[PDB]
Design a protein around this ligand. Sequence first.
Ligand SMILES: O=C(O)[C@H]1O[C@H](OP(=O)(O)OP(=O)(O)OC[C@H]2O[C@@H](n3ccc(=O)[nH]c3=O)[C@H](O)[C@@H]2O)[C@H](O)[C@@H](O)[C@@H]1O
Ligand SMILES: O=C(O)[C@H]1O[C@H](OP(=O)(O)OP(=O)(O)OC[C@H]2O[C@@H](n3ccc(=O)[nH]c3=O)[C@H](O)[C@@H]2O)[C@H](O)[C@@H](O)[C@@H]1O
Ligand SMILES: O=C(O)[C@H]1O[C@H](OP(=O)(O)OP(=O)(O)OC[C@H]2O[C@@H](n3ccc(=O)[nH]c3=O)[C@H](O)[C@@H]2O)[C@H](O)[C@@H](O)[C@@H]1O
Ligand SMILES: O=C(O)[C@H]1O[C@H](OP(=O)(O)OP(=O)(O)OC[C@H]2O[C@@H](n3ccc(=O)[nH]c3=O)[C@H](O)[C@@H]2O)[C@H](O)[C@@H](O)[C@@H]1O
Lengths: 389, 389
Amino acid sequence: FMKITISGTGYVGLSNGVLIAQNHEVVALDIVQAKVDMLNQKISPIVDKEIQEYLAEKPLNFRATTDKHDAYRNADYVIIATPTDYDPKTNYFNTSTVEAVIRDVTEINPNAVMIIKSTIPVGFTRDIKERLGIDNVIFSPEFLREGRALYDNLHPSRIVIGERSARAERFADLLKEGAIKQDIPTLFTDSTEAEAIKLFANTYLALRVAYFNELDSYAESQGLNSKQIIEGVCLDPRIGNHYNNPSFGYGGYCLPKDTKQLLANYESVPNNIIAAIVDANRTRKDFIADSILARKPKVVGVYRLIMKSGSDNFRASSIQGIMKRIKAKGIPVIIYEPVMQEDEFFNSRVVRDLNAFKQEADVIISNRMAEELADVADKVYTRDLFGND
Amino acid sequence: FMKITISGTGYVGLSNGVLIAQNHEVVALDIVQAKVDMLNQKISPIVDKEIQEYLAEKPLNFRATTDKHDAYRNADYVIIATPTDYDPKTNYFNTSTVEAVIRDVTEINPNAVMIIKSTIPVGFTRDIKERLGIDNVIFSPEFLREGRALYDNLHPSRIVIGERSARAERFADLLKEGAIKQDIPTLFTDSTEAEAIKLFANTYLALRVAYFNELDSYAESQGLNSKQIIEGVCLDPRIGNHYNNPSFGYGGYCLPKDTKQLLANYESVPNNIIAAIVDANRTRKDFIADSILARKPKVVGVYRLIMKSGSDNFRASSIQGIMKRIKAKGIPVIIYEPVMQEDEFFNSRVVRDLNAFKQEADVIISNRMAEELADVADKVYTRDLFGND
Ligand SMILES: O=C(O)[C@H]1O[C@H](OP(=O)(O)OP(=O)(O)OC[C@H]2O[C@@H](n3ccc(=O)[nH]c3=O)[C@H](O)[C@@H]2O)[C@H](O)[C@@H](O)[C@@H]1O
Ligand SMILES: O=C(O)[C@H]1O[C@H](OP(=O)(O)OP(=O)(O)OC[C@H]2O[C@@H](n3ccc(=O)[nH]c3=O)[C@H](O)[C@@H]2O)[C@H](O)[C@@H](O)[C@@H]1O
Ligand SMILES: O=C(O)[C@H]1O[C@H](OP(=O)(O)OP(=O)(O)OC[C@H]2O[C@@H](n3ccc(=O)[nH]c3=O)[C@H](O)[C@@H]2O)[C@H](O)[C@@H](O)[C@@H]1O
Ligand SMILES: O=C(O)[C@H]1O[C@H](OP(=O)(O)OP(=O)(O)OC[C@H]2O[C@@H](n3ccc(=O)[nH]c3=O)[C@H](O)[C@@H]2O)[C@H](O)[C@@H](O)[C@@H]1O
C-alpha cells in the first residue's frame, strides 16, 4: 500500500532506502545516470558492507531513477538526502539541493510528506515552510556513520522526528519496522528542536575528539605516555572508554570548520564550543606538522588521503592540513592513495606503487596504523593508539 | 603494624583517613585546633553523611592532632591533603601548603613515603623531588566529590598511583582494602602522568558542563525546549544521559577560571580546551544575568550562595558572577544563605528569614530548584532541569 521516495542516493539515502524497502515500495531518485544504472543492476555505487549485500541478496522492493515525475508520483513520503554542507568558498551553509528538491515535490506531488534527512541549519524547516507556504516538511536527523550506514539504521541509537503528529509517527514506524534492534527510543519534537538536536550531537562528538587530540598533543610535547593518561582519564564512567582515539585532527560533522565559516554563521551555532573545536583542530595540525618536520625528513610520504578506512571523502580529511603545513616548508611530499586517479595532488606526486612509495619516503605519516605498513613501522609517524575510528 | 598520617583534614583528608582507619592506625594532622578537637570527640567538622556516621558509629583507629612531631613519628605513609588552588589575586597556582608539608616530613621523618592527594600542577612532583633531593614523594589523584567524599572512596571509579613500585602497590592495597567496591581498576604510572590524568579528567568534566550550558543558552535564546534537545542529544550512547544538568555556570575543578589565570599558567594546561570552558562560562553568566534583567525586576533575591546542596564553598559558586552582573546595573540584591554569618555580602543585604526574603524579592534566582521555594515557583528563575548536581 505505501510508497516512499528517496531523493539523493548517497549513503544516507541508500541506507534509509534499503531499510524501508524490506517492507515497502521504495524508489531512489538521483541525478547521476550512471549511479542509478548500477543500482538497478543491484550493484552498490558506494562501499558499505551491508548496503552491498542487502542490495544483492535480500528481497527488496527497490529501484532507482533519474526521472523525478515517475519517482515522486504517488509517493506518500519523500526522504530528502541530497548534499548539504558549508561551501568552502563562500562559507555559507549550502542547502540548495534540499531547497530544489522541495520546490520540485511541492510542484509535482504537493501531497507527499517530505522528511528531510540531510543536515540543515537550525530554523531551516520552519522558515521554508513559511517562505513557500507549504506544510508538508518535517526534519528528522540522521545519526549514521559513513561505512556503517545501513548498519546504524538496522540498530539505531534512537529516532527523532521533527513533528508531533500522526504522520510523524507513521514514519517512525516505517523506520522501526525495518530495524533489527527492538524498542528503539523514539522522540517526537518540533522541527527547530530536531535540527538543534542534530547540531549539538555532532558538536559534542567533534568536541570529544578535539579534546582527546589536545590531550594527546600535551602528552607528546611533555614527554608523557598518551595511552596511560587516556586510560586513567577514561576509567571515570562519566567520561568513558570510547571514541577517544587520537588522530591528526577531526573532519566532517557539517560544522563550521575554520574561523571564517564560524564567523559567517555564528548565531546559527553555539559560538564558544565551535570556536573551541576549530582552534583545537587548527592547533593540532600545527603540532602534528611541527612534530613531523622535527624528524628533519627529506621526503614525506602521505599514506592515504581518505580519513576512515573504506571512505570516499578527501574533503574532510585532516591529513590534508598536515601536507599543507609540511609543503609550506618546502619539503617534498608523495602520496599513496589508490582511490585517487590524479597523478598529482596540489603538485605532490601520487605514487601508484606501494613499494616505490615505501622506498622513497624517509618519513611515512598515516592517520591510522595499517597492516600494509608493518614492514616500515620504524619510519611511520601516526598518533593512532587504538586502531578504531 | 602500619601507621598512616593524613596531613590536612578537609573532606579529601578525612575521606582517606576514615577509609584507611578501618584497618590501620590513622593520625590526622591539621593546623586548626578547633577542628582537631571535634574530631577527637568523634564529631565531623564538615557535612558529609558517611564521614559523620563512620566517625561516630564504626570502630576506627583514628585520631587528630595539631602536633606534627607526634603526627609524623613512625608514619609509614603520609597522605598530603592540604589546600591547593589558583590564587585569586596573583593567579599563580598555589602549592605552598604542600611544599610546606613536604619540608616538614622530610625534616621530621625522612623515611615516611609521602602520597600527594591534593591537586598539583603537572610536573610538580618530579620537580620537587629534584629541587629538595628526596625521593619519597608520589602523586595519586583524588576523584571524589565534596559531600560524597567517603562514599566515592568506598566505591572509587579507579585508583591511580603516580609510581610503578612495590611501595606504590602497598599503598593501593590500603585503599582497596578499605573500599566496599571490589576489583577496583588500578593503574600505576609515573608521577607526571598521574598529575596529567587528574588535570585532563577535571578538564573534561568542566568541558561537559560548559557544553550543556551553551546548549541550554542556545535553546533559551532561540525559544526551544532544552529538555527535549538534551534528551535527543544524550540518547547517543557516546554522549550519555548523565552529568548534563544546565546551571548558572560551573565552578571549581582546580582549573584556571578566567583568562588571566589561563594566561598565567598556559603551557601547564591544554590551552584551547581551557580557553573554551573559560569563555563559555563567562558567556553563560552574561546570558543568565541578561536573561534575569529582562524580567525588569525591582529586587532580585539570590537563593543560596553555595553551589551544591550541603556545600561549604562560596568561592567557586557561579551564582556570584550573576549577582555581580545584576549589581552592575544598579538592581538591588538580597541574599538568603543560612551558612553565611555576614549581614551583607558585597553590600547586598543577607536576609535571615526565608519568608521576608520571599516577599521582598520579585525575582528569586536559584541554581537548583528547591522544595522550600515551591510556594513561590512563579517568580523563581532557575535553569535546573533534572534536580541533580
Ligand atoms: O552527521 C555526520 O556526518 C556523522 O558524523 C559522524 O560520523 P563519521 O564522521 O562518518 O565517523 P566518525 O567516527 O564519528 O569520525 C568523525 C571524525 O572524528 C575522528 N575520530 C573519531 C573517533 C575517534 O576515536 N578519533 C577520531 O579522530 C574521525 O577520523 C573523523 O575525523 C558521527 O559519528 C555520526 O553520528 C554523524 O551522523
Ligand atoms: O588553504 C586552504 O585551502 C584553507 O585553509 C583553511 O581551511 P582549513 O580547513 O582550516 O585548512 P586545513 O585543514 O588546515 O588544510 C586543509 C586545506 O589545505 C589545502 N591544501 C591541501 C593539500 C596541499 O598540499 N596544500 C593545500 O593547500 C586544501 O585546500 C585543504 O582544504 C582556511 O581556514 C581556509 O581559509 C582555506 O580555504
Ligand atoms: O577535583 C575536584 O575538585 C572534583 O571536582 C568534581 O567534584 P565536585 O565539583 O565537588 O562536584 P561536581 O558535581 O563534579 O560539580 C562540578 C561543577 O559542575 C556543575 N555541574 C555538575 C554536574 C551537572 O550535571 N551540572 C552542573 O552544572 C556543578 O554545580 C559545579 O559547578 C568532580 O566531579 C570530581 O571527580 C573531582 O575530583
Ligand atoms: O570581579 C572579580 O572579583 C573577578 O571577576 C573575574 O573572575 P571571574 O571568576 O571570571 O568572575 P565571575 O565569576 O564573573 O564573578 C565572580 C566574582 O564576582 C565578585 N563579586 C561577587 C558578588 C558581588 O556582588 N560582586 C562581585 O563583584 C567576586 O569577587 C567573585 O569572585 C575576573 O576574571 C577577575 O579578574 C576578577 O577578580
